[PDB]
């Protein structure tokens, strides 16, 4: 029986699985009114990807395809007809919520669209177009292979093979950034399907543990932080995918250890469906040294009583 | 002895180690007049990182730090005083060519700077600043902790903590994109230090094998492709770092296999210093199916004669 293991990576060596930026801290908080059902960064401990999860951070919130002129519309001057990583048209009949890597938060995603290369004399960054991809637009239908592009800088050309590089999120007067409200992958008034399940603590006194990053915000949230919290960093997802070690129990007891002091700082429950719970009450950014990392201890059932963190 | 292994990943499941985009193809070519001495994606087979190589794709050609006003006189309206992943000031005395993740190509890197969040009414993408980072500028001195920022869109504010997200490259009338000319990390008229060694084929009939991507080009190279070629994908670098398996000979013989036909398509020599050679003459994008991957076969010496590819 292949042993289950975790990669040995400090917090600064981990990538957010919901946006291509490094993890900054571990963070716990109650679920109060949030449905915790993110679709990127979903993977069982025995290596089964779930939701819209794939292996490349460079594909998370990244899009590519052909631009289609959309005249008669205030917001999206063009659409993007999405293609697979190598030009193949996306099949909406796959049993997934949306193309793998699709943004799994509600609101505005900001990035740069690039298109056919232009001559040097055309101008500086003339093939770079700042665009908003808003999930509240009626044109946000990634499940059927089309999203709406709202150009901000540098008019976008139709009928050109284009790539979208994500930079951050945005919040304008009527579109709040809501990381735990899934977007309508199939368009307005349509409900989401084939979703990775929502997660929540089920043992008394426990809370979810998140890998937390601050995403750049190009509009709004003055004096505030745009947080993106994932259940698993990308490197854990990829490690479980590679190893495919069979799960021997409901929970993998993991201990957070400091390697040069040799002491365990706290412990947590890594559930077989791919998320972590800790014994704590309240919103709390975890105070841990920069060289610490989780270590797989043993297989326990879901009724294991953690030491309070 | 811990066995040496490669990760089981297809071409579309690999990331360029020199720019945060996926690998598109394998590509071999003679060195003719290029010095092949890239500094990102450099790692020995037993897990020794070299050059400017670190583990995160989100750190390659990404920068962060404090903006500094620069009036007088050239290209760069502001400088970026570089800081570590968590705000620590960069130490120029470290035995490395430049901060880890620093671009290792000559020319113009394009991306978006983000700064202190602004209110919603400030405007769309107002906290998004399109900038050129040119290595031919006298302000390109990342080895001493500072680079020059040429603003294209959205004036950059001084004295703000800022993050630069890379998007692509650019080529203007006098700054060609040269992926095999290392930039002057320490400024104009200064030579580079602490470099990972240059690589070249040393056996008759052999050429380097590259992992190739097309990087977005926001100015110039009309009708052309801005290729970035790396010696190792990021996933191999991180795998070797995790495993740290001892190298038993000068060369790891590796075979490219198709897993659903069972056939071996070609073989190659993976040298212990972390680069691949193949038996081929001429520039050639390798014609291989999308499901193929490299498999470690055996340890051989540097004089192993490969089957012609
Ligand atoms: C900031 C604001 O309130 N803008 C209003 C527009 O709202 C945008 O609508 C598009 C869809 O067309 C997206 O949903 C985007 O996220 C929204 O911010 C609205 O379309 C127009 C209607 O006249 O009014 C603007 O004020
Ligand atoms: C396109 C062009 O010819 N530009 C010239 C400027 O060259 C730039 O110089 C900066 C450093 O100052 C960078 O090296 C950049 O990559 C260059 O393109 C040059 O500075 C000015 C002199 O006035 O002339 C421009 O024509």
Numbering used by the authors:
A (entry chain B), B (entry chain A): 3 to 311
Copy out sentences from the published article reporting this entry, exactly as the authors wrote them.
Human noroviruses (huNoVs), members of the Norovirus genus of the Caliciviridae family, are the leading cause of acute gastroenteritis (AGE) and are associated with almost 20% of all AGE cases worldwide. The major capsid protein (VP1) is composed of a shell (S) domain and a protruding (P) domain, and the P domain is further divided into the P1 and P2 subdomains. The P2 subdomain is the main determinant of NoV diversity, antigenicity, and glycan binding patterns. In conclusion, GII.13/21 huNoVs have developed a novel GBS that interacts with glycans via the common β-Gal through a unique glycan binding mode.
